[PDB]
Amino acid sequence: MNTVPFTSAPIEVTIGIDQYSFNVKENQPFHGIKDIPIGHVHVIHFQHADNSSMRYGYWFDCRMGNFYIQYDPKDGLYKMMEERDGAKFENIVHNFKERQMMVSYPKIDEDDTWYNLTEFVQMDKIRKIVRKDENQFSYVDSSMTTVQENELSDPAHSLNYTVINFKSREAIRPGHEMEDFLDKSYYLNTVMLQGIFKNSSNYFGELQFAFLNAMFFGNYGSSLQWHAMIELICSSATVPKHMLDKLDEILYYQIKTLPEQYSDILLNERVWNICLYSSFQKNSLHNTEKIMENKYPELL
Amino acid sequence: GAMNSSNYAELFNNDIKLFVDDTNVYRVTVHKTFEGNVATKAINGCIFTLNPKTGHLFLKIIHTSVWAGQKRLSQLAKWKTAEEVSALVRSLPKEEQPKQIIVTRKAMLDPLEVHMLDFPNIAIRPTELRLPFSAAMSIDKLSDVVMKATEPQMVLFNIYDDWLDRISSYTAFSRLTLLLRALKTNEESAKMILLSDPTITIKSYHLWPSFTDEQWITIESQMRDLILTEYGRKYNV
């Protein structure tokens, strides 16, 4: 069980840790988060009481180093930082725990929600989508644009998701125009799975990361990426049987977790209607169709 | 974006463009089988690809053999239309290639866009205009070459005959759309109006009769009367 200590909380902020969130008051004696489960990536995220605009946060894996949060009064945000001195870090954490100024990552023992949302997500892959190579953790916020969004401006602060475009030479083989456009199996299986992602685990990892950036930061381009990667599978007639079974489980937990009040802007009506009712895979997502029909029958 | 009344004059500028109409590509007769079920028999079709400035018509004949052993023919027809238009553009020298293609029906946008990915600089556009190009098969000489074809064939026409010697392409296009609108609303009346006087003939190299300027006015007037009547009939007004 790992710890992300906080130097202080000088400004009033809603703090998110994975799917949980807590209010901290201006200058409240808060020194961070303990009992964080090892074995998963985590995200710690922020929304200032005084500007509910710019949700921002840090993807990190406690196995990759000792990370803490310190408010920067110049840049006006809670910054993640690495302490390289292991012994100095243990001493700081030990003090704050003895004085009980830390909240406990509140994991219910029955609850596999975070594992199910992050099953295929790996810090090494996150660091290729979010390029800032001098840090072992990755910064994301509401306003960051995707490489594909920038094509249609600052490359350093972009989300480097895999570009998917159904009306692209990459997606359509010369002389197989109608076939490749109506059945995207070629694009899914040869171009994306065999060619770029190498396996379904890396494809699911990017899909899951895009969803979580959409849900936690309201990142519009992440939402576009999440829908594109669902639609590419649902619009393919030929998908490995294990991928369909795993996709149904992935989407079930994403829809289960989504705040009820955000379904109207985070869920694309056309994509879901097409995927559940029109597509080759319309009969292959039993769990996902049942939760969507019982929780959001309006969108359909 | 979409071609409408507000940007109508664009058709007659010096940027090469083509209209593509797919409404006569897949044509069937519906009939009863011996068992009393219903079946279709396909007949020859055509892609109507028109330069509205020059009058040059690229009439690609669609022979019934292209449908043999195919499923979902109404969907395949849109993709075959897109493949034939793409092939036509690639056959033209670069300085003859269109800068825009305007499809008369929105269901042609994705098939044509996907076929023309090699031509990112050619804009594929819908229109809000209700153009009567479906009536092309009421032009006797175009209907004749489609129905006689025994194989796939491209035939070149000038749908304005020699009108551009005397009128602008704006006026030639207005005359063509009035003639086709008439032929679409009441084919027999329209065709009676055009050929009633046997002193006016169709030249062997032309589609329409050799009317003087004065006789075109009279003809244009008869076509307008036919269209308004039938509209009063249709809508009891």
Interface test with B, best of A166, A168, A173, A178 (most B CBs within 10 A): A178
Beta strands of A193-243 (E only): which ranges? none
Last residue of a domain, one of A101, A123, A143: A143
Task: Please answer whether residues B151 and B119 qualify as being in contact, where contact means their C-beta atoms are separated by less than 8 angstroms.
Answer: no
CA distance A181 to chain B (A): 8
* Structure token digits, residue A258: 């989504």
- Contact at CB, A167 and B110, closer than 8 angstroms: yes
Range of the domain at A231: 144-300
Contact in structure between A44 and A80 (CB atoms under 8 Å): yes
- For residue A176, the chain B residue with the least C-alpha distance is B115
Within this chain, do residues A134 and A271 fall inside the same structural domain, yes or no?
no
Q: Find chain A residues with C-beta within 8 A of B76's C-beta.
A: 178
- Which CATH number belongs to the domain containing residue A226 in this structure? 1.25.40.550
Whether residue A250 sits in one domain with residue A116: no
Task: Judge if A121 and A170 occupy the same domain.
Answer: no
Residue pair A114/A18 in contact (Cβ under 8 Å)? The answer is yes
Region of A24 please: left (phi>0), alpha (psi -120 to 50) or beta: beta
Contact call for A167 and B76, based on CB within 8 A: no
Cβ–Cβ < 8 Å for B104, B127: yes
Tell whether A154 and A16 lie within a shared domain.
no
Give how far A204 is from chain B: nearest CA, Å.
Answer: 28
**Residues ≥6 apart with Cβ < 8 Å to A297:** none
Among A123, A143, A163, identify where a domain stops. Answer: A143
State how far residue B178 is from chain A, nearest Cα, in angstroms.
Answer: 36
Closest to B118 (Cα-Cα) out of A165, A174, A178, A179: A174
3-state helix vs strand vs coil in chain B, percent to 5 = 45, 20, 35
CA distance A66 to A63: 8
A11 Cβ contact partners less than 8 Å away, ≥ 6 residues apart: A26, A48, A49, A50, A71
Q: How many residues can be counted in chain A?
A: 300
Residue A38: CB atoms within 10 A of its CB come to: 10
* A75 phi and psi angles, rounded to 5 deg: -80, -10
| B31, β-bridge pairs | B39
Is there a single domain that holds both residue A221 and residue A193? yes
Which residue of B71, B84, B117 to mutate against A (max A Cβ within 10 Å)? Answer: B117
Same domain, yes or no, for A107 and A225? no
The reply to whether A242 touches chain B by the CB within 8 Å rule is no
Nearest alpha carbon to residue A44 among A52, A126, A36 = A36
Q: Could you tell me which residues come within 8 angstroms of residue A85 by beta carbon, excluding any fewer than 6 positions away?
A: none
C-alpha to C-alpha distance for A260 and A298, rounded to whole angstroms: 12
- Residues A231 and A274 sit within 8 Å (Cβ to Cβ): yes
One domain for residues A77 and A224: no
User: Domains along chain B?
Assistant: 9-163 (3.30.420.230), 164-237 (1.20.80.40)
Round to whole Å and give the CA distance between A67 and A64: 9
> Exposed, middle or buried by CB within 10 Å (0-12, 13-18, 19+), for A255?
buried
Contact between chains at B117 and A167 (C-beta distance less than 8 A): yes
DSSP track, B103-154:
ESSGGGHHHHHHHTTT-TTSEEE-B-S---GGGGGGSHHHHHHHHH-SS-EE
Q: What's the domain count of chain A?
A: 2
User: Which CATH number goes with the domain that contains A18?
Assistant: 2.60.34.20
Which residues of chain B lie closer than 8 angstroms to A168, CB-CB? 117
Check B111 against A177: CB less than 8 A apart.
Answer: yes
DSSP characters over B27-71: EEEEEE-TTS-EEEEEE-EEEEEE-TTT-EEEEEEE-GGGGTT-S
Longest Cα separation, chain A:
70
Alpha carbon B151 to chain centroid, angstroms: 20
Domain's final residue, options A89, A113, A143: A143
- Give the closest residue to A34 by CA, choosing from A26, A44, A25: A44
Tokens of B23: 């409404």
Indicate if A18 and A108 belong to the same structural domain: yes
CB hemisphere CA count around B9 (13 angstroms):
1
Q: Which residue has the tokens 């493949």?
A: B83
And the tokens for A275?
A: 């995927």
- The sign one gets for the Cα dihedral A96, A97, A98, A100 is positive
- d(Cα A55, Cα A46) in Å, to the nearest integer? 6
Question: Which residue is closest to B76 within chain A, CA to CA?
Answer: A178
